[PDB]
Structures are given as C-alpha cells and as structure tokens.
Design a protein around this ligand. Structure first.
Ligand SMILES: CC(=O)N[C@H]1[C@H](O[C@H]2[C@@H](O)[C@@H](CO)O[C@@H](O[C@H]3[C@H](O)[C@@H](O)[C@H](O)O[C@@H]3CO)[C@@H]2O)O[C@H](CO)[C@@H](O)[C@@H]1O[C@@H]1O[C@H](CO)[C@H](O)[C@H](O)[C@H]1O
Ligand SMILES: CC(=O)N[C@H]1[C@H](O[C@H]2[C@@H](O)[C@@H](CO)O[C@@H](O[C@H]3[C@H](O)[C@@H](O)[C@H](O)O[C@@H]3CO)[C@@H]2O)O[C@H](CO)[C@@H](O)[C@@H]1O[C@@H]1O[C@H](CO)[C@H](O)[C@H](O)[C@H]1O
Lengths: 694, 694
C-alpha cells in the first residue's frame, strides 16, 4: 500500500528528453584503448545511456578497505563528454573473492546444508548481517564519490535480486524467518492455525521451533502454508536488503533509482508488484521465449510490467539483440525481430530501451550471449539493426511518444504472484496446473479476437475495468472476495476459470463447494475436480465440449447451476466418465453485472473459439473482421489524447494487410499505401493518429 | 515361520458383528463443535468404526512428560455413545517438534550424510535407542489410560512403517547392520562369501569394516549381495520396532492389534509376508492406480493381501473415496467406482472397509486428498455414495458374509518380496525387468481367460495348488528349488517364466545354464539373454512368436530342449538376430506333472492369447465362453459352503451381460432379470448362492 513518487532519469545538461537507448557497458572487461571505439560506435548507433559497474566490486574494492575509482571516473568522463548518460550501479550485485574467503558466513546455504560457493554470481544470503555491512559500505563510497557527477543520471541498485539467491536455509535465514513469522502472526498459536499444524504432529510450542523448510527426503511433502510463507519471506528478505541499499545511496546522492526486475509470464522468484512499490521507476529484464509464443509472451510480460508500473513509464533495462546463452538451445532472432521486439516493449509503455549488453564478451560465461556489437564487430546485420533502431527511437520521441501511456483496455487480466506460489506445492490436484499459464492464455485468446488486454496485479485497480478475468487465481482473500462480489454487483463483467478461489490467503480451503467464497457470484457449485493426463495407459486425457473445443489437463465437476445462470457449453464424453452432458461453461446474472465461469483448461485455442459467444453475452464489443487476430494493436496516448500512437504487430507467418489510420512513423518489414499497409511476418508499423480525425 | 493366533476387533457391548466400516478420524483438526455433526453424519452413513489419534503425539504429549488425554477421552466417549467403535492408535507414528529439537540424533540420515529434517512425517531412525524410549513411553501411557475403555476395540500401532523411513544410513544403522550381519552369518568369512567380496578388493577382515551402502558416486554399482541384505535388514529393523511397540501396548492393554501395510502390485518397501507373521490381523492401505489397470491391480493387491493373510479375514484400513493428493496428476474416481472398489477388497476377503479419511482437511498437506465428507460437505455425490456403501455392507453382513473366506483358486501365482529386491540392482541384464510386474501380468491374463488366480507369497502353501506360476521369480533357494521339483514330480502343473531361478538366496548365480537349479524340471537350458528396447537407433525392440504374440524387453536364448519336452511356440525374427525358429514357449513332462516355460515377456495381452493351448496341455479347465474375460468373478464361502457369495465385476468399457446364478444382494451400475444381468462399465453385482442348488 503506497507507491513511491515517480522519478525518471533526467537528460544531461543541454539535452532534450529522449527515449533512453543503450545497455549494460562493461569497459572493465576490455583494454582502455577500446573505449574510444565504443563511444564512436555508440554515437553512430544513437546510444544515449549505458549501465556501468554492475558487477565491478572486485575492481572498485580490489581488497578490503582499498578503493580504485579512477578507471570508472575516466570511463564516465568519456561517455558524458560524448553526450552519453550513465546509469550507475551500486556495484554490490556480487561479492569479490577476498570477501567470501574472509567471510564464508556470507554464502547462501541450500536445503541440504550445502554451501553455495563462489564461481558464478550472487552467492550471498539475503539475511547476512555481514554481507549487509559490506554492501552498504560500498554503496556509501560510490554515492560519496559520484554524488556531484553530472553524467550520472540514475542508480541501478544491485542486479536482479533473487535470480540465484532467492532461497537460503542458513542459521541467518532461520532466525530471520522466525522474526518474520512473529511480526506477521504475533503468537505461535496464530502460526499453528495459519499453517494447519494439527496434522502430522507438526504443532509448535514456540517460535524457536520454526525452522526453514529444509530437506525432508526427496519426494516428501512440505507443509503448504509454511512453504507459501517461506516464499513470501524470501521475497521480503531480499526487498528489505534492496531498501537498505537504496536508502544508503539516496541519503548521500539522491538520484532516480531502480532495481531490475525479471517480469515474464512464468517468473515469480519475487512478488514483483510488491517490489514495484519501492522503486522510483520500474525497470525490467526480459528475454524472448523461443518458438511460436515469442511475440505474444513478450507483449504479455511488457503489459504486466506496465501494470506493475500502474501505467507510469517504465524502463526496459535488458533484452537481447539475438541469442541468449543460458537455454539448452539458444535460438537466434530472425530478421526484423530485433527492432520488432524492442518496439513491443515500447508499445507497452517503456520510455527506455536497453540491452544486455553493449559489446559481446570474448571470454567468461557470457561470451556466447548476443550483444549490440557482436564478436563479428560493427560490420554485422546486428549492429546495423541496432543503428536503425536508434534512429527509429529518436524519431518517435521527436513526434511526442515520451510520457504517453499505455491506453486503458476494456479487459483486465488479474495476476497474483502469491497464487502462483500456492499452485506450486507438490500435493495439489495436478502438477500440470499452475496459476501463471492461464492469464497468458487469456491474453493470447483475447488477442485472437482482436482485443488487447491489460494485465493488472491483484492489488491494482482491476475493479475499475469494463471486464475482468480471474485466471486460475487460486487464492481469494476475504478482501479480494469482497472486491469481486462488489465489482460484479455494480455492473462488472467477470470471467472466472477453474482453479480460482480455492483457498484464502493462508491456503485454507473455502468450504461448501468451489469456488467457495464466490459461488453466489458465479452461480455454480463444483464438488471435485477431474485432472487429465497421459501418465498411464487408459487415463482420461481430454474432454470435448459441444462448442467445438477440447479441454485438457483439468476439468471441474459442476453439480449445480443457479436459476439466475445458464449453461453455454457442455462436455461431450463417454458415458462412464460421468461427463456426458455436464456443464462446462456458464454465465450468471448477479446484481447489475455478469460472471462467466470456464470450468476447464481450454488453452489459447479453445478460449479464442469460446470467446465470441461469451463476449457477446457480457456486452463486450470487439472488431467483427475475419482478420481480427492477425495483428496486435497497441496504443499509447497522453491524458488529452492529442498525442496518440498505434503500434501494429503481425502475430502470424502470413502477410497481414491492415487499414492504416494515421501518419506512419516507423515501418519494419512493412509497406504502406489509400490508408493500407502490408505487414510481413515479424513486421511492425507505428502510426501517429491525427487528433482532429477519427 | 509361525503366525500369531488370529484376532479381530470385537463389536461393542450390545452390537452384533458387522463389516467394520469407516476410516481415519482426525477430530483434533477441527473445533469441538464439529464433532457432534461428524457423529450424526457417521450414523447416517452407517459408519461403525473409526481410527483415531494416528499422528496426535504433539497433542497427547504437548511437551516432554506432559500428557493431555482429555480431548480424546471426550471424542471417544461421543463416538462410543453413538455406537461407533474406535480403533485407537499408539500415537507414535511421527514425533513432535519439541522432541526432534531436543534430540536431533532421532532423525534419519540419507546415503550422503544429510539429515532428514522435520517438516513432513516419520523422520525417525528405526534403530534410534532414543526414539525407541520415547515411543514405548507413549505406548505405555496410552495403554494405561485406555486399557479399561470399552469403546476401544483395537490398536493401530504407528502408521505405515517405512513409507518415509525405510532407509537410514546413520551411525545407529551402521552398528545395527553389523549386528544383524553377525547374527545372520556368524563369521566375517561367511559375509565375505555371501557378498562375493573377492571382487574390487572388497574383502573384509572383521565386522567393524561393514558399513551401510552409503554414497559411492551417482551411477556407480553397489555390491548386490550387500544391497539385498541392506533391504532385508531395513525391513527387519522396522519390524523389531513394531514388535516392541506392540508388546509394550499388549502387556498393559491386550486388544486385537495390527499395523497398516502398503500392499500393492509394485510396493516392496517391506517384506510384508514376513510382517504378516507379527500382526494379529492383517490390515492394508491401498490406493487405486490410474487408467486401464485401476480395477485389475486393485483386485490383485487385495488378492495378495488375502494371501499374506493365509485366507483369514483382513482389514482394509485405507483407500480413497476419489482422488489422492500425492501423484503428479491426481485423477478422480468415475461414477460407481467408490462402491465398486470397496467391494473389490471385500470380495477378496476383507471384513472391514475404511478410508483415509472421514472429513477432508481444510488445511495442511492433505487438504486435496478426497474424504468421506468432502470440502463440499454432505450434500455431495461422494457422501451419498458413502451412505449407499454403508447400507450395502450392512446388507451383506445380514446375509452371512462375515468370516466367509476367499475361495481356493486353481492357480497360485507366487510372489517374493526378496526376488523383487534382487531384480532392483543397477547391473542386471536390464532395468526394464523387475519381479513385480510379471505376477500382475499373469493375474490379468488368467482373468482374460476366465480364471481368478490366488496370489500366494513364496513362504505360503502354493505347492498345494492345482497349478502354480513362477513369474520372474529371480531367486530360488535350495529349499524352494526342492519344493518346486517335488511339487511337479507329484502331479503339479507349473508355469515358469524368464528371469526365474537365476540366483539363490544370496544372489549367487545357479551355474550350468539358466534356470540353473531346475533345468530338469522345465526341460530347457538357457545360455544367455536378449534384452530388448529402444535406447538407440536400430536396437532390437521386439520378437514375434509364431502363435501370433509379440515379446518385448527380454527374451531367453534357449539352446536345448529335453526329450520329455516339446516346443509350443517359436520366435520369428530376421535371420541375423539368431532368433528365427528359436524356441519361445515349451512344455515338459516331469514325473506325474508338467512344467511350461515362457521364455520371454509377452505382457498381459501376449500371455492371455498364449494361455488356451497351455491351459489345455496342463489339463487346467476353464469356461469356454467368448465373453470369459469381460467380468472378474470372485467367490467367498464358509468351510461348509452353505454361505457362498459371488462378486461380479465388469473389467471393460462395454455393457457385460452375465448368467446370474443366485439371489442378487447388491447391484451398483447393474440391472438384473430369467437369471440374467447387464453390468455397466465400473459396475458390480453381488449374489448369494442357494446352497441346495448348483
Ligand atoms: C531475466 C532473466 O532471464 N535473467 C536471468 C535468468 O533468469 C531465470 C532465473 O530467474 C530462473 C530461476 O527460477 O527462472 C527463469 O525464469 C523461468 C521461470 O522461472 C519459469 O517458470 C518459466 O517457465 O521459464 C522462465 C525462463 O524462460 C529466469 O528467467 O537466468 C539466467 C541463467 O542463470 C541468467 O543468465 C539471466 O540473467 C541475465 O544474464 C545475462 C547473461 O549472463 C546477463 O548477466 C544479464 O545481466 C542478466 O539479465
Ligand atoms: C499405501 C500408500 O500409498 N501410502 C503412502 C504412499 O506410498 C508410497 C511410498 O511407499 C513410496 C515409497 O517407495 O512407494 C509407493 O509405491 C509405489 C511403488 O514403490 C512403485 O514400485 C509402484 O510402481 O508405484 C507405487 C505407487 O503407486 C507408495 O505407494 O506415499 C504417499 C506419498 O508420500 C503417501 O501420501 C501415502 O500414504 C497415505 O497418505 C495419505 C495422505 O497424506 C494419508 O496420510 C494416509 O494416512 C496414508 O495411507
């Protein structure tokens, strides 16, 4: 509750505002003579900001209490003198070897008591008082040294908290988890009650009896209430460390500050919407998913970023020019995708576009990760494309893109980090169902029907939207249950799926029939589930619906439908399953609103096909056109609507022709005409609308 | 050698004998006001026994030397006053947190020296003298308190020994394994000889040099003799703990006592047939396997339970109303299956039918496991079905089912826990072959041919049967070899498969040609094996036989056939494999008997098709009808045969019509006529035969 005031990295003295463009720069990894070439190439590419010193601790503090800043003063001076701004890191992302050799108590400990060693990065415990002292000291030294530097426009505090150190099981974590439980519950009776410890003789007499969820034998079942709280605690322990580092910097050197998130459809290492309350601006690292979901999942993640940002501008701190280096198979980007993907984030509300990283490493663990200047060097398709992007972004700022905001959708898809965590336990109805996939499925299926959804975290203002999707939203607290009931009562249009509202925020089941807190709203009562799969011969692996769709993985057993509701689709099945003729999809009237219930996993394709009848019943208007789905349309506008941009992205492997409605500004793999344009696969067109017209 | 005298939980004062019906009850997990509702619902459902206090240690002994019995006196009083009996637990199944915090030496240790922590259940070492002292103390306190309680009719000692703590590698286990080896072998020379330690420089000078089979590098090969003995020792160490707990209870409070087994086709955590010698009555927990084997594997496991029970009545301590919560995908039961599955166990000789559990948990690790009263509550298909079952079981006891016994089959399928263990080593001909699958395959294939097999442990009286199957029975001791030779000599009909009699009880190979101890009996000599699979391109993955069947995974290389034998089926293969025309299935004459040899894995379907010619040759008579296989017929009768029941179960997804031969008593998804009945998929009919008729 409560965001910090929005702050943004400001232009250097004498510059106009720009879409910030550039990325991580690691000059410490090259001979100094390379730095003049870097700068010349950056000017060519239109680069205007770089992120420096992110893992430079071992250079800045080469041994305890010895500081070496001169190389970085020098780099920062050459950048600034060329008009390139610096987003400066704290430098505290990962500790040097001298530190972990003197203080092995810093290193995080795994569920079995094995100590993560140096050799990669981020091997520190979030609750180490010793690592905290080291970090805050370096933050103070950096702040003191760079506080009156005019080329430094922002702090980049640490890097991707929890990417490697989400979980620690040390004695430090044990003591901190105990204190976090006492602060959250007050008494051990309220912990026993929250975690349901009357089973398996788990009841505790005092706080000292709370241990971390350490090794219990592989395959055995941890207490779910406790594991959910362990995840909340791990997120909060890292957030407290961020806050301390932030506050140490800001007290000496008050500049716009952020830390880079890892928002993507499937990453929930942290409750990023909570974290969004502690940053001045939201910044995000996102790397494409391979294959057919590349475009859609990226637009989704960018959308959720914007939703975390409460529609404020946000900063894309990283993405790749082409391949990453950490998947089993590191696919390259296809032609056009470098520009398209950058513009996808821009469309969804970013006012900074940055890459990991500027110059591709020639040695170390990152050498095979793509860069803005590849091994090949500047004479490459990649660097030319980087240059073209630089020019596109200068153009879009010249035409007024800056501080426009992602337009308000008709539909808010709700997302809850905590509901995901809840669905991750091993003793749920099926390991094939998690929260995270369903909102992405709804985003894509709505796209197929010509509608661009907003993705809104559960804390944010989804109840202001024309329609709302609760997508496998396993947790509904008392508070959220009330928000839902009121939302619908007062004219809302609600879609609710299987695996919604199973439990409260303690992972206590809502009894009486699922979804046990909102049966009245949805007008159905579910008695049990029917998971599906192919784990043994003869298992039930699908259910047909009578609207021509197929359910996989999970279906609800709906045994009553209220009088104020009706059935829109029914399962068709072999008689012995009990599903022949059972209700699959319903719609209910509730006060002035409506709620549809989708009682099974239909996937993108099933939902896409199911949606027309449901959009019609709920009075949600969309384009009628056959080619509706071919292109994702994304809009930004200022509050007045006089600067309005539309970004059009082909989602397909066919040429998409579209009615073009304003002035074309940027075209990648697209040709304009007569208000027509043909967009090649992986193509994008961006248009500025004339405010005096339609 | 030597069973205890059979004892059975007796009716409460003023009741007649009943099929015990109910399950685990955990009132400690609900507010006390719920207990009056539980009791009212139990009466409605026909519930007449519940199992209480199984994991209640942390409530009964909330801290060391403080006892709190009053809540359970109260619950037991309300149950008893409503006519519901209590199967009372020892309460010692899993220790409280205060205990493991004071005494971490209690916790079991894994192969790598990592200590299993509290967080789930049963984290105690079988050979901890300290955990033993705690357990026996609580057993004495419970026995003393409940010894003159008339509503307590049995002891339920601990719960599922070895489900989580089968293996411990602590210093306690090291010392105990040393003593178990000395007690078994007498001298270190006899251990060296048993384990074959002259390879890999493993020879030991004394007992102190025997360590547990701890971590040797993942992928490396433990000594097989030793690992087999480790498994026997782990089973015996838990059995000694059971015996001590039992004897501590019984000395103060002599009531019928059991501990719940985990008999299923594939579970061999313990030598359950040995354990069967130490219980007063056999009790079993069994949860359905998903997909097409659900019915058959359950009938098998129930059958093996009965065989462990030496045809005495046995107690089904647990099974599920619908889904469990511990598989990757927790399928629900289909309509009818709740009643059908319960009656399957009943048919195979159970005189008690109980579920985990009475009321579905609303919190903790078990919340998604089905119950008799689901989250949904009593207004559910599940609770109605539980009520219908209650009524069916009252009816069947009124008609005389109690203490009838599962009829003697023509065929005994032999099962050996130890042979399974032997086949589990990593350096066998193939990891795709284990003992356990073959007896289940034979049970199903015989069912397909209209015969209901008995499953008889190797120690029991299989040599009294008309026919006997040795199914991948890898171990044949000197003693069992002699029993087999005599059995056949004297008129027995024997089926022997691939992977039988490879080794003696020390895992020493019988030399000269497999199966090296009974070549004379089976009239074949095998020189080597041909495992099969798809592990690389071009591997041999099957062999056709000339009776229209296909072998997969394993075939024997038979190189001679005795004069008293002939070949019934031959492989057909590409010439270069060497299998074209080689013998696959033989029959031999040996004294007055016969032995068939099935020299490959044919599966249920191959064996089913192979069986007519083999049943004909061995003079085993079966129904001739085409629809033979559609229904499993299972019979119980008293010694006189004047109370005779027949249970008929559809195995198929078609409607099965059957000739009905007595008075119909219970019908689920079946309709009776003219002595005809039509049984729907998942249906069952139970009939009492008129003793004066056919
Ligand atoms: C944003 C990002 O990807 N950064 C990391 C990368 O992140 C992965 C980890 O957080 C793991 C930990 O659970 O989860 C991955 O997300 C999963 C998600 O958990 C699944 O549910 C879902 O289905 O799939 C996604 C993956 O698609 C995170 O994405 O981890 C790699 C490997 O450690 C890092 O290399 C990467 O950070 C970047 O590394 C670059 C190369 O070394 C640069 O260091 C750059 O500074 C970083 O942004
Ligand atoms: C009878 C039963 O299933 N009880 C346990 C369950 O048992 C499994 C374990 O013993 C593991 C250990 O090896 O083996 C499983 O059997 C395997 C077998 O080993 C394989 O060869 C074969 O192919 O598959 C079977 C599985 O189908 C045992 O079945 O383990 C679960 C998970 O730990 C327990 O939840 C279950 O006990 C019941 O748990 C309920 C829910 O918490 C209640 O506590 C109830 O009291 C228990 O009966």
């Amino acid at each position: 509750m409560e965001h910090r005031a929005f702050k943004w990295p400001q232009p250097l003295a004498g510059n106009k505002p720009r879409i910030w463009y550039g990325g991580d720069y690691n000059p410490d990894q090259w001979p100094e003579e390379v730095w003049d070439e870097d700068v010349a190439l950056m000017q060519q590419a239109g680069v205007n900001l770089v992120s420096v010193a992110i893992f430079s601790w071992a250079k800045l503090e080469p041994e305890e209490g010895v500081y070496d800043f001169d190389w970085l003063d020098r780099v920062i001076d050459k950048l600034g003198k060329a008009g390139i701004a610096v987003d400066l890191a704290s430098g505290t992302a990962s500790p040097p070897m001298w530190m972990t050799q003197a203080h092995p108590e810093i290193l995080w400990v795994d569920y079995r008591g094995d100590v993560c060693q140096p050799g990669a990065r981020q091997h520190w415990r979030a609750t180490s008082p010793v690592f905290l002292d080291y970090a805050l000291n370096l933050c103070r030294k950096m702040a003191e040294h760079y506080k009156d530097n005019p080329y430094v426009v922002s702090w980049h505090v640490s890097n991707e908290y929890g990417c490697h150190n989400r979980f620690d099981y040390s004695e430090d974590a044990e003591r901190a988890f105990q204190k976090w439980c006492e602060k959250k519950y007050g008494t051990i009776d309220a912990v026993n009650d929250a975690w349901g410890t009357a089973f398996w003789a788990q009841r505790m007499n005092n706080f000292s009896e709370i241990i971390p969820p350490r090794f219990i034998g592989d395959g055995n079942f941890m207490n779910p209430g406790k594991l959910l709280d362990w995840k909340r605690f791990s997120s909060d322990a890292l957030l407290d460390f961020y806050k301390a580092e932030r506050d140490a910097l800001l007290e000496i050197a008050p500049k716009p500050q952020t830390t880079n998130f890892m928002v993507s459809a499937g990453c929930t290492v942290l409750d990023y919407d909570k974290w969004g309350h502690d940053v001045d601006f939201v910044s995000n690292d996102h790397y494409f998913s391979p294959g057919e979901a590349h475009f859609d999942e990226m637009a989704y993640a960018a959308c959720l970023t914007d939703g975390i940002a409460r529609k404020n501008p946000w900063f894309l701190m990283s993405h790749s020019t082409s391949a990453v280096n950490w998947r089993p198979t590191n696919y390259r980007l296809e032609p056009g995708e470098l520009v398209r993907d950058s513009l996808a984030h821009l469309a969804m509300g970013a006012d900074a576009i940055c890459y990991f990283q500027w110059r591709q490493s020639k040695a170390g663990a990152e050498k095979w990760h793509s860069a803005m200047v590849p091994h090949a060097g500047p004479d490459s398709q990649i660097f030319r494309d980087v240059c073209e992007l630089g020019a596109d972004l200068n153009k879009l700022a010249d035409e007024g893109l800056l501080s426009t905001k992602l337009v308000k959708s008709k539909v808010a898809i709700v997302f809850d980090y905590e509901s995901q965590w809840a669905t991750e336990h091993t003793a749920t109805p099926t390991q094939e169902v998690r929260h995270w996939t369903e909102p992405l499925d709804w985003f894509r299926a709505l796209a197929d029907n010509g509608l661009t959804a907003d993705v809104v975290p559960v804390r944010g203002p989804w109840d202001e939207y024309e329609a709302v999707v609760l997508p496998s939203l396993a947790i509904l607290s008392e508070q959220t249950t009330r928000r839902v009931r009121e939302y619908v009562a007062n004219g809302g249009k609600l879609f609710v799926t299987y695996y919604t509202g199973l439990v409260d925020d303690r992972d206590h089941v809502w009894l009486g029939g699922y979804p046990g807190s909102i049966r009245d709203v949805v007008g159905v009562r579910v008695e049990e589930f029917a998971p599906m799969g192919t784990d043994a011969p003869g298992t039930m692996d699908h259910l047909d619906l009578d609207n021509g769709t197929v359910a996989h993985d999970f279906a609800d057993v709906i045994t009553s439908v209220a009088d104020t509701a009706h059935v829109v689709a029914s399962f068709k099945a072999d008689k012995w399953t009990g599903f022949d003729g059972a209700p699959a999809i319903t719609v209910n009237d509730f006060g002035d609103g409506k709620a549809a219930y989708v009682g099974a996993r239909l996937g993108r394709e099933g939902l896409a096909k199911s949606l027309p009848a449901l959009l019609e019943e709920l009075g949600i208007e969309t384009s009628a056109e056959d080619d509706r789905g071919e292109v994702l349309r994304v809009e930004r506008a200022d509050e007045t609507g006089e600067n309005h941009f539309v970004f059009l992205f082909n989602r397909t492997h066919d040429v998409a022709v579209v009615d073009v409605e304003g002035e074309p500004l940027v075209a990648s793999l697209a040709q304009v005409n007569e208000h027509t344009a043909a967009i090649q696969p992986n193509g994008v067109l961006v248009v500025k609308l004339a405010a005096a017209l339609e």
